[PDB]
Design a protein around this motif. Sequence first.
Motif: not given
Lengths: 477, 477
Positions: A357-358, A361, A363-364, A408, A411-416, A420, B363, B411, B413-416
Amino acid sequence: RARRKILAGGVKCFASNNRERKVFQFGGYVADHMFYHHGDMSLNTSIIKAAQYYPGSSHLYPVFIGIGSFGSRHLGGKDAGSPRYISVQLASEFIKTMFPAEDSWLLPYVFEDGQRAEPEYYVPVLPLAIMEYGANPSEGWKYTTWARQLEDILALVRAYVDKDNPKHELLHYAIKHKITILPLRPSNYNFKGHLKRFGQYYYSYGTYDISEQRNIITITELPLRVPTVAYIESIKKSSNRMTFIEEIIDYSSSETIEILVKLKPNSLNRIVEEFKETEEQDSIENFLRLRNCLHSHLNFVKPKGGIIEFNSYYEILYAWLPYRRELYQKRLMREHAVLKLRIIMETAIVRYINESAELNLSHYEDEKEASRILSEHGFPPLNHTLIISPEFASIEELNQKALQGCYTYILSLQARELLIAAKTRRVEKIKKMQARLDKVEQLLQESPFPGASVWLEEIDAVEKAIIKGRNTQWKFH
Amino acid sequence: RARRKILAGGVKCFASNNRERKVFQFGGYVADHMFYHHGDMSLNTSIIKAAQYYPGSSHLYPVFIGIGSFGSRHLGGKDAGSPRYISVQLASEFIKTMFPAEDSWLLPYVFEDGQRAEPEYYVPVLPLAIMEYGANPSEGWKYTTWARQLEDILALVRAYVDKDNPKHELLHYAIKHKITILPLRPSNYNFKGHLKRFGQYYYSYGTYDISEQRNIITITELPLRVPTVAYIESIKKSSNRMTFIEEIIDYSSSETIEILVKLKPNSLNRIVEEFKETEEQDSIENFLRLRNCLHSHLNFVKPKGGIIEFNSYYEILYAWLPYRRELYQKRLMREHAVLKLRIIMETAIVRYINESAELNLSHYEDEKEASRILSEHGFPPLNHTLIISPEFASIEELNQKALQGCYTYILSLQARELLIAAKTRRVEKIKKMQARLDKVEQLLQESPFPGASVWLEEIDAVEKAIIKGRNTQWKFH
């Protein structure tokens, strides 16, 4: 053999914590995991034989910490206590230095009945096949061999590793011509006697003290590998020597050796006139059976199966060194091969945050066209949970199942994880592990053999554990 | 009392699985968790008393499944077997229907020594305080009460819940005036005798068969709550009645009752001329002690502490109903209060995906200014792991600790979870649980009391478990 099966028991059972455990409870754990089907009694007598700590014992350095009293030198370790009451404790300090934990993942493991089995042979820092005397782990046949001192093998291994030793190429010169200029002498621990060498055999002799003022004969030291009770009965068998023996009373005790012998001086002048006056040694150590014949019996396990016999102990040390030397190269190359995969995986995640998101994108991520569309994005399709957690995988097998990996990890990581601050810790993880890659790259390139510098440190680590165990009360703390 | 302590043992121990467990092992589990300090023997005799299954037992419907033989009607349950060998199995089908699992979270729990304790009283679907006879869970004092049939209390509770019963307002009319027009009769299970009512006491009488052709007196049925061995010794005490008794031999057995009595016919013409010729009942059931006096002793636990005595069983059913009726309202309101919080949390996450990499980026989320900046974004600061996992929290306490919640449901959540397919499942979770909110909103609004419709279904669920247990071999499967 069965000794190596017990070896994996201590590390596996005490992986969580190194505490006090009962011998039988540990034995049940060993047979439960590594499938010991020879019986707990055979396992228990093997554990004590593996953990015996007394002068004259086959095992000089036990795998586990000796707890309580397992016997004395009088019966030669056959006076062991009750297995149920006694406890066993793994020597964590020695076992990790003697057997490196990271090297265990590369050791050649055999597979039986679709499950892993213990390795055929181990390749530790110092060769356990020479440092320990022969014994009888099984029944009926007893193996007989004598251990070398901890100063001649150390000088030999340091000669084959460290370049600073002047006799470095001299040892290498002796390898091709089999001349063996370097010395190699038997163990001298807890033996205040003598060792004499004629021909091709050794003989150990005790020490006796004779005082003219009191006319009392004192015997100081026993032969090298004799039980105390054996000498009591052996001297009673000879009827000819019994006439000269008016009386023998043993005053020796544990941790204090002092024997008083009352022999009439008139018998001293007539023993020498009928014993042929042997010139090799005095008649005092001839009339008293204070010698043993050391018939060198050498047995080493064949890599392809079977047993081999060597004329001297040099052929064992000169054969054990290359196998340990070879696996130092494989240990560094595999660790080199996993650090470079970790750089690829970590950098992709770090650079993914840049295209997160920096800036961009994507994400699809439809599972059909994510295959080749992401290919031009530079994201590698490497499988996760393998680089971060290496297993019993060879270098050749590692690359095959890493390049043809799976997603996996992305794009399966934690949103944190794409925040940054998270990228800063993620990108700085690369350079710390990049610097470690450089040192390994700087290694494995020496002319003699790869991993020479780490060998010296591992040799010293073994010495540190042995010194600390003997300096303390065998507590390693 | 101690009975309710054992009740929580079955559900907690068998929460993972409902299998066969030893009585003593279960008893050790109960005292380990709920702190039973009266001794395992008192616990074991209470477990059997709670799980007794025989005619005349205090517990008609045991909490657990009867395994093996716990005795017979001859000794009145005092012939229990060895607790160690016998096993106990929780009746999962009955216990969840009789005691709703979701209602357990709202039951009033007391706290002792800073830890939760069992509730003072339970409020099940059907009142356990009337369906079971009196007993002696403790020693010394024995409580004596008689159970009602399972057809009069059912008609009474359905009259206070279902509007279709013509005597609905009639029951409500009887509540204010305490006239109690509806009937209420004692239990009649496993009693093929008679029950007769004069004044303010009941008396149970057995059945006897007299045949003129064979001149043999046959006794068919015993009184309601008499052990078989009690009647054997009681008839031997009276010396006056022993003269008429030439011989009595018991031929009755388990699952087959048939007693042959040999009485001379010449004694039949002279028993009636000296027993005053009682007109209330025949002399056959007068000479033979086939009656018992039912002195109604009623004890119910006070909500504030103490014991209360009621003149009739009506005052118990008319007092048990409101407490169960009141907590139906609280059960739906709390479930209503948690579904509306779940809609707020789920919709915020669904709408977060809209403001995720799809459309907008936020973010940066510095922990200092994320407080009020995100406030205008519409994201609610509700604490996670509470709405998805409700606990023993009241309605008033739920709102206080939910509105003043915390982040990390966002924020983290899993990225999926913000992928296109994930939002579709997330947004569709709202409407399914929105529809469930509508039905609950449609409920809790009836004129008589909230949750009337669910009460009838729960009543039927209890009947289904009881019928299936009796229809099968007490296996519930």
